């Protein structure tokens, strides 16, 4: 008797505790059903997959520089001096069933985690989901993005490898040791001595399995709690105002679709872990200071820092008996990037002057300057990311390496400006398109007027029509407009039988009539709620 | 203008978010001010200190069996093959400034964590805090205790040492291989091979710094949330009923005293880490299968399992072509111990019939059978612990080793019975003493009657006095009774000046009558609330 068991367990729960009111509040909480609001959920799910795979990896990984001859199963690396970290990473890859798959899906989950954090940041920045409220949420999210970047940096550096060890030698050692006043001191504190210090990988292992992931988990908890109790903002729409949340309740629809999205995201990650090879450490021999490859790139999230290193024009300063290497330039650049990213909402509010409590998002077109600035920043980030890849770009796409380097150098001041101007004008022209649609109706097929040979597009007004043909122009309301009769009630009722065969006419008529009635009911409910709110 | 800054920050917080009602609820939450309710806080604080010191330790610890010659500073161990784990533990002890202190305070915090968990378990069990509302809390707390025990095991097993290594060899390896159908398979899965498998310490390091601490943190969060929302139970008292919490609010008093208690617990643990030497691994050479020591004990929280191993009388069964060693006996014993501990509240309610919502604690005297059973269990646990220590007990206290082993064997069935009987009768006699006080008043000095030579103790009634000398007996209300006029309004007004010199008589009188007024005001307020609840 499952129903009896469920009722008895509910009574027991509500007797031991009294969670009825709180649980009802959680279930009734309404969440907007916009697709762009699942971008953060992508990052959350990738983080969960990262945790689950990381536990499995920690069950088999041994962090240490203690030198060992492989004497394992991978023949091409046998009798070669390697660290225990590399040896156990190879053991995971080869001598543990499914270990290669687990580490590959872990690395793919890391890449998706970074990418989805970046896409979520784009969404919130361009839709203005940070101003007045949620500004602290944006701040902690920026901290979270930085932590994710460095977490992946320590992760793919964890198995002592030629590629990743070269990346460590470049960034962690050179940049740290070039910093003027305390650079060498920070280097020695971090590495326990010179660069190959015997504690680097154990320290990174601690940082990467417990310390940084613990902070990421705490900040994700704060992030999700803030989103939960500072009700999710929504785009302007029919019944959507600054003092309501139009969407679907947590229990029936939102919960099921979020769980299904989690399932699909982990399916994509597993499929990629299987079919796409990520970080073949067996190909990448053990780290040796004397050995190196030509690629020498970090993961795509640190690729912009690496590209900054490559592009910056070798400017070094030599004060009285001292040196200020080019590493400090990139270090200060990263510091500025992170400071600006963290402090943007406060910078934006100081500049514009808007401290009003904003709960309705604004379409990126409706804010030309901010969308222009975001496009400029994304252009700079892409420029740096491809500058880091200039080696392979030059190799495959036949362009001289010096040409790629100088293309990056010139573009990082030219391309951001070009993209800013183009994005600003593009946003304003999207606004102009919205206004033309508002004042003339949607466009359709052309008709030749009866008496004379006039051609008229035969528009379709979106609002009340004046006594004569032309309609009364509507006022923009911050919400998307239908620019194709395609997406309106025009040519959208195919025979509802099947792909191969029809259904009985009675069933088809019943189905289509019921669907039309449901559409009428939904639109009327939205219209009446909107009228009640604004009247 | 700190006041203005605080006001502006509060307004900004209440504008961005709306935490006014929730924060007021948290601040106004009332917590009973009984000392025994700080026992769980002791464990929580020791856990926090454990986290803080463990992060520092992981910054310097390298888990690996990779063999290395020390070549450090510690002269007595130079050129000796040791695992990198032992080498880095020695590096923490000697090479790192304050590393010895950090690891010692970490181990002392582990011992205090186990001890305070045990004391808190005793408190709740004997006071009946596990009844209907909080059996789930009891269950998760039992899981927490088990996790704490095993994490301490893995923690003092992390630095591969002679003592910890032989303890691992005995408990983990032997008792795992002993298990009949899957013992050897479990051993091979855990160690990745034979006992000295080269993944054991990395696996334990992961389990100990990330996995088990994560589960313990989640369970402590659930525990504290349950205590917070299922308002803390309280002992019977003047104004205390099953539907109220008499105590102090969170903000002014409880928060301050809890923070101060955490400070003092940290101070005790730091003082111990300084003055008392805990696990001096340097005296203990690196683990070798051949080297041994006479002591060979685990930490006190696993000493009971070790004592079970020692005492259980070598009963092995040999099915058709197989063996069932004596280790499986102890494995089943531990299983039974944990199962009974976790399932006691449900066992208690099945036995007694209590399905009532209990919010008033029971005095251990007021619940004899449960008090007797708890005393019996504590006696068994102490017998097992001292049986594990029987080696050192025999060495120092001159008792034959065989004599101690057989004392343990006989007493593990005799001492529990003796302690059960004694505790049951002791509880009933405490009840009898309480009723004697209720019916005769508190006892005082003797007086010789005027006409004849009778001697009367000159009692002091605690309630209304009959028309004649003898008082009207009061009804027992589950609250402690004052058996000394010491603790009542008698002999409690020393000169309030100072230790060496007095104060002006006007000041002394003002202070003393102010205190008298305050204490009688408190008594009257409690009395009025008690009368108001029913009257
Ligand atoms: C970790 C990462 C993983 C993801 C986790 C994050 C998830 C966050 C989502 C939040 C959801 C939530 O908390 O809902 C709970 C929600 C609590 O809030 P509520 O009920 O709305 O109370 C009124 C408002 O809270 C009153 O609030 P308000 O609306 O007036 O606004 C005030 C708000 C102001 O807004 C804020 O500032 C909120 C943001 C908090 C900041 C950071 C705190 C979170 C840090 C998390 C760190 C994790 C590590 O302050 C808060 O409410 C703070 C609450 C903090 C809880 C955060 C939880 C995480 O309700 C429940 O408790 C429902 C669940 C019931 C549980 C019992 C079920 C049966 C019991 C069985 C037990 C055992 C069975 C055996 C038999
Ligand atoms: C980790 C270990 C470390 C220790 C952590 C554990 C501490 C737990 C203590 C709980 C205290 C608590 O949650 O109070 C919050 C409490 C939420 O509860 P409430 O407000 O009473 O809401 C009505 C009741 O919750 C309605 O509940 P009810 O009284 O009707 O009974 C229903 C109850 C049923 O009872 C239960 O079953 C509760 C037990 C929950 C089971 C396990 C959940 C917890 C798991 C934790 C795992 C951690 C890892 O269900 C719940 O309430 C579940 C709530 C779950 C929250 C647990 C938090 C942990 O109020 C607040 O949120 C106050 C704090 C406000 C925060 C905002 C401050 C300013 C914002 C600034 C943001 C950034 C500034 C930048 C500018
Ligand atoms: C720092 C910086 C940007 C320096 C400049 C160097 C650079 C990137 C130049 C552009 C690269 C191109 C497009 C070369 C082709 C020749 C060329 C320049 C033609 C004119 C360009 C132009 C304006 C054309 C008009 C129409 C148009 C927009 C055409 C674009 C055509 C292309 C190539 C589109 C895709 C862009 C693209 C993927 C460029 C390479 C960038 C990267 C990082 C590829 C990564 C990558 C590589 C490198 C693999 O080898 C590989 C092997 C197996 C599986 C996967 C991959 C993989 O994903
Ligand atoms: C399994 C099992 C319990 C087997 C029996 C072995 C055993 C514990 C026998 C009892 C030990 C005793 C009390 C020996 C003294 C001789 C004796 C038996 C006298 C008769 C006992 C009796 C009924 C006396 C009447 C009055 C009475 C109650 C006297 C008790 C006297 C004592 C010793 C009280 C304290 C109890 C106690 C600490 C016993 C030893 C237990 C342990 C584990 C001590 C651990 C310990 C040791 C071993 C150190 O060397 C040490 C060195 C430096 C700093 C700290 C320590 C430290 O903590
Ligand atoms: C060789 C080898 C080892 C292979 C394995 C690889 C490995 C190591 C690990 C991966 C293996 C596993 C275990 C994969 C599956 C992971 C997993 C749990 C998937 C669940 C998805 C699934 C099976 C769905 C079935 C379809 C179905 C009926 C769905 C509805 C019922 C379900 C499952 C609902 C789940 C709801 C859900 C995702 C809860 C997540 C809980 C968390 C952390 C947060 C909740 C939460 C969410 C989800 C928000 O979006 C949100 C947005 C704004 C503010 C707050 C929140 C918030 O608090
Ligand atoms: C990849 C790209 C790089 C990354 C890009 C992200 C960084 C943030 C982006 C842009 C910041 C500059 C914005 C433009 C600032 C406008 C200047 C001005 O002239 O002030 C006019 C305003 C309007 O006032 P109004 O009553 O509307 O009158 C209309 C008059 N025509 O005045 C004010 O309130 C504000 C005056 C002071 C503003 C100070 C803002 C900067 C604070 C320091 C942070 C560092 C900035 C880094 C810059 C890159
Ligand atoms: C681990 C990284 C992250 C996780 C797990 C995460 C998760 C989420 C989720 C699930 C939401 C609600 C759904 C949505 O708005 O799409 C959200 C909202 C938000 N995120 Fe994040 N995000 C992350 C990174 C970031 C970054 C880098 C920023 C900057 C940021 C700022 C915000 C803001 C301001 C909101 C509020 C949006 C709203 O209220 O509509 N987050 N986050
Ligand atoms: C929080 C976000 C995280 C990110 C972005 C991340 C990223 C990465 C990446 C990219 C790798 C390289 C894998 C490879 O090269 O095969 C890695 C390795 C590893 N990660 Fe993480 N990780 C995260 C969290 C975790 C967690 C929570 C754990 C433990 C529970 C963990 C444990 C490990 C281990 C043990 C390795 C070494 C595997 C190997 O050497 O192949 N990671 N991580
Ligand atoms: C990590 C281990 C533990 C921590 C951090 C912890 C913490 C706490 C704290 C602070 C309290 C409230 C204060 C008090 O009642 O003394 C509490 C209550 C409680 N604990 Fe634990 N405790 C732990 C172990 C245990 C164990 C081993 C049991 C069994 C248990 C069962 C309970 C129960 C039933 C309560 C409710 C008592 C009440 O309502 O007053 N806990 N715990
Ligand atoms: C939660 C309860 C915990 C308990 C009961 C516990 C217990 C112990 C004990 C008794 C030791 C032996 C120390 C020595 O022999 O000097 C130890 C070692 C260690 N603990 Fe834990 N610990 C806990 C949590 C943690 C956490 C959270 C971390 C990491 C953040 C950690 C990291 C370490 C490390 C790295 C060692 C080895 C250091 C050494 O060998 O000296 N512990 N643990
Ligand atoms: C850990 C749980 C331990 C479970 C043991 C499962 C024993 C399976 C093999 C028994 C066997 O027949 O082997 C031959 C036998 C050794 O020789 C004899 O035929 C005469 C032996 C007379 C003593 C009988 C005592 C039985 C007590 C147990 C039934 C109680 C278990 C609780």
């Amino acid at each position: 008797d499952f129903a009896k068991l469920a009722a008895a367990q509910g009574d027991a729960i509500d007797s031991r505790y009294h969670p009825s009111a709180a649980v009802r509040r959680q279930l009734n909480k309404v969440f907007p059903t916009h697709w762009s609001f699942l971008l953060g959920e992508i990052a959350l799910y990738s983080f969960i997959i990262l945790l689950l795979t990381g536990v499995w990896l920690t069950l088999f990984f041994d962090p240490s520089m203690a030198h060992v001859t492989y004497d394992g199963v991978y023949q091409p690396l046998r009798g070669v001096q390697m660290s225990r970290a590399y040896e156990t990473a190879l053991d995971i890859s080869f001598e543990v069933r499914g270990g290669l798959f687990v580490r590959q899906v872990h690395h793919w989950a890391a890449l998706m985690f970074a990418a989805s954090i970046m896409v979520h940041l784009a969404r919130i920045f361009f839709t203005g989901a940070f101003r007045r409220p949620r500004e602290a949420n944006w701040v902690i999210g920026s901290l979270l993005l930085i932590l994710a970047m460095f977490e992946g940096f320590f992760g793919y550096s964890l198995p002592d490898d030629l590629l990743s060890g070269t990346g460590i030698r470049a960034a962690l050692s050179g940049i740290t040791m070039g910093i003027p006043v305390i650079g060498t001191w920070m280097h020695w504190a971090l590495f326990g001595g010179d660069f190959p210090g015997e504690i680097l990988i154990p320290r990174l292992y601690a940082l990467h399995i417990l310390l940084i992931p613990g902070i990421i988990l705490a900040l994700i908890g704060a992030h999700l709690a803030l989103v939960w109790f500072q009700k999710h903002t929504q785009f302007p729409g029919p019944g959507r105002t600054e003092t309501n949340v139009v969407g679907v309740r947590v229990m029936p629809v939102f919960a099921v679709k979020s769980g299904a999205f989690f399932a699909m995201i982990t399916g994509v990650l597993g499929l990629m872990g299987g079919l796409l090879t990520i970080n073949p450490i067996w190909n990448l021999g053990p780290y040796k200071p004397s050995q190196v490859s030509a690629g020498s790139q970090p993961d795509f999230y640190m690729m912009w820092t690496d590209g900054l290193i490559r592009l910056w024009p070798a400017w070094e300063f030599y004060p009285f008996g001292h040196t200020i290497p080019q590493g400090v330039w990139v270090a200060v650049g990263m510091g500025l990037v992170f400071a600006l990213l963290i402090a943007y909402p406060f910078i934006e509010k100081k500049v514009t002057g808007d401290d009003a409590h904003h709960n309705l998002l604004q379409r990126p077109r409706d804010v030309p300057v901010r969308t222009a600035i975001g496009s400029m920043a994304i252009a700079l980030y892409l420029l740096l990311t491809f500058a880091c890849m200039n080696d392979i770009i030059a190799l495959k796409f036949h362009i001289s390496l010096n040409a790629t380097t100088w293309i990056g150098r010139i573009g990082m001041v030219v391309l951001p400006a070009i993209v800013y101007f183009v994005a600003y004008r593009w946003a304003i022209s999207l606004q102009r398109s919205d206004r033309e649609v508002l004042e003339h109706g949607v466009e359709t097929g052309i008709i030749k007027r009866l008496p004379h040979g006039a051609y008229v597009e035969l528009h379709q007004p979106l609002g009340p029509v004046d006594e004569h043909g032309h309609p009364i122009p509507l006022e923009y309301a911050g919400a998307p407009l239908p620019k194709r009769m395609n997406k309106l009630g025009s040519g959208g009722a195919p025979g509802t039988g099947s792909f191969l065969f029809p259904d009985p006419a009675v069933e088809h008529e019943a189905l289509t009539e019921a669907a039309h009635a449901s559409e009428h009911k939904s639109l009327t409910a939205l219209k009446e709620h909107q009228d009640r709110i604004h009247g």
Side-chain angles (χ1 to χ4, degrees), chain A:
Chain A
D1 196 346
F2 276 101
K4 181 176 184 291
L5 294 173
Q9 287 297 109
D11 192 9
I13 287 162
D14 201 273
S15 69
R16 307 281 180 281
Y17 335 96
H18 42 281
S20 277
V23 163
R24 197 199 53 241
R25 284 196 288 272
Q26 305 331 282
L27 297 195
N28 278 335
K29 184 166 278 287
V30 170
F31 270 96
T33 50
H34 199 260
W35 63 267
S36 84
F37 303 165
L38 307 175
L39 299 177
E41 310 189 355
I42 297 165
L44 173 62
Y45 301 148
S46 70
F47 176 64
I48 285 158
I49 296 304
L50 276 161
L51 257 66
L52 295 164
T53 53
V55 171
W56 196 98
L57 287 163
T58 53
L59 291 181
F60 294 94
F61 188 73
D62 184 354
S64 281
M65 272 71 76
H67 316 82
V68 302
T69 52
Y70 188 48
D71 191 359
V73 79
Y74 188 60
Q75 310 268 36
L77 292 159
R78 278 190 71 85
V80 310
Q81 308 300 122
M82 66 179 53
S83 41
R84 268 290 296 173
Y86 192 64
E87 197 207 40
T88 45
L90 289 180
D91 292 333
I92 289 160
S93 309
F94 296 111
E95 315 202 58
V96 183
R97 191 181 277 187
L100 176 52
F101 169 55
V102 164
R103 66 179 289 283
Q104 284 206 151
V105 66
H106 189 67
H107 198 152
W108 279 122
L111 294 192
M112 176 170 277
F113 182 56
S116 51
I117 290 166
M118 292 178 174
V119 168
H120 185 53
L121 185 137
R123 203 282 300 178
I124 61 185
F125 172 92
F126 285 118
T127 63
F130 53 77
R131 56 222 207 290
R132 182 30 162 271
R134 331 212 158 67
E135 59 194 52
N137 203 0
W138 158 281
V139 163
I140 70 180
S142 298
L143 311 188
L144 215 42
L145 156 61
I146 297 158
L147 289 164
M149 276 169 55
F150 284 104
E151 180 60 16
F153 178 40
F154 303 149
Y156 79 78
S157 303
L158 207 48
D160 196 11
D161 196 356
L162 191 49
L163 184 51
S164 79
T166 307
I168 291 293
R169 178 78 187 101
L172 255 186
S173 171
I175 308 299
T176 308
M177 192 174 71
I179 294 154
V181 177
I182 57 171
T184 175
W185 286 79
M186 299 200 328
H187 179 285
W188 272 56
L190 170 54
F191 289 80
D194 205 358
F195 160 69
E198 297 176 354
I199 208 74
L200 172 58
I201 297 294
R203 197 161 290 170
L204 294 188
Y205 186 79
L207 277 163
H208 172 86
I209 75 159
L210 180 65
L211 198 149
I212 290 175
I215 299 168
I216 286 160
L217 188 68
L219 282 175
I220 287 164
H223 206 84
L224 271 43
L226 290 162
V227 172
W228 196 263
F229 294 115
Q230 208 169 32
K231 264 157 276 296
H232 196 283
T233 171
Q234 49 173 10
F235 279 105
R240 294 160 183 70
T241 76
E242 296 250 316
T243 67
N244 77 344
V245 192
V246 193
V248 296
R249 300 168 321 203
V250 158
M251 182 61 204
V253 168
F254 173 70
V256 56
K257 72 165 60 162
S258 73
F261 188 43
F262 183 12
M264 276 211 265
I265 288 298
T266 183
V268 168
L269 286 177
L271 272 159
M272 288 209 301
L275 310 199
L276 300 165
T277 300
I278 187 88
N279 196 26
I281 57 156
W282 56 86
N283 288 136
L284 318 171
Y287 181 64
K288 301 290 175 66
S290 49
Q291 302 174 357
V292 70
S293 180
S296 174
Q297 276 100 18
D299 282 334
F300 76 80
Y301 35 87
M302 291 296 243
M303 270 190 214
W304 73 268
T305 67
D306 196 302
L308 183 56
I309 297 172
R310 319 219 174 169
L311 295 182
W312 199 251
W315 288 326
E316 282 198 7
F317 300 101
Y318 310 108
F320 316 99
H322 293 301
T323 299
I324 293 167
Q326 183 259 318
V328 314
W329 275 109
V330 59
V332 169
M334 287 174 66
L336 260 293
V337 171
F338 298 147
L340 298 161
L341 191 90
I342 292 158
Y344 185 77
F346 315 106
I347 286 158
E348 171 141 313
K349 90 173 63 254
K350 187 265 285 179
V351 171
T352 69
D354 269 72
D355 331 310
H357 187 117
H358 288 105
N359 275 305
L360 287 176
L361 297 166
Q362 50 201 54
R363 299 168 83 205
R365 79 185 59 195
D366 283 335
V367 58
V369 172
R370 189 169 71 213
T371 186
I373 287 155
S375 300
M376 181 163 60
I378 289 166
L380 180 55
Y381 156 82
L382 280 166
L383 185 141
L384 266 47
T385 290
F386 290 121
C388 167
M389 303 190 263
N390 63 16
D391 189 278
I392 302 105
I393 281 154
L395 162 67
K396 295 295 186 219
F397 305 81
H398 297 72
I399 297 158
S400 58
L401 192 73
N402 298 4
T404 61
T405 298
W406 273 103
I407 286 158
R409 264 172 200 191
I410 287 154
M412 86 194 182
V413 288
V414 164
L415 179 65
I418 291 162
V419 170
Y420 174 90
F421 176 79
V422 169
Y424 186 73
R425 299 307 184 88
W426 200 325
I428 291 160
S429 50
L430 291 170
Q431 298 170 357
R432 223 154 283 281
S433 173
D434 280 8
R435 267 50 167 196
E436 97 191 20
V437 166
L438 285 167
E439 72 184 2
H440 292 306
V442 189
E443 299 92 343
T444 55
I446 285 89
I447 182 178
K448 186 150 61 204
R449 288 265 277 273
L450 265 288
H452 40 97
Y455 293 101
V456 302
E457 201 161 10
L458 191 66
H459 302 254
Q460 195 274 331
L462 293 178
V465 68
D466 189 14
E467 286 97 29
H468 80 300
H470 209 261
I472 299 100
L474 299 87
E475 57 275 16
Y476 186 60
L481 298 154
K483 304 190 168 53
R484 303 172 286 159
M485 299 300 318
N486 177 359
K487 311 296 280 161
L488 304 188
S490 195
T496 194
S498 176
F499 195 98
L500 286 302
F501 307 90
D503 273 350
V506 306
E507 280 180 350
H508 162 55
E509 292 297 330
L511 278 179
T512 188
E513 290 176 355
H516 185 52
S518 80
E519 300 321 323
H520 267 292
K521 188 180 286 183
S522 71
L523 198 138
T524 297
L526 266 296
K527 199 185 75 198
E528 292 295 328
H529 179 83
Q530 184 175 211
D531 300 0
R532 184 184 334 126
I533 294 297
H534 306 116

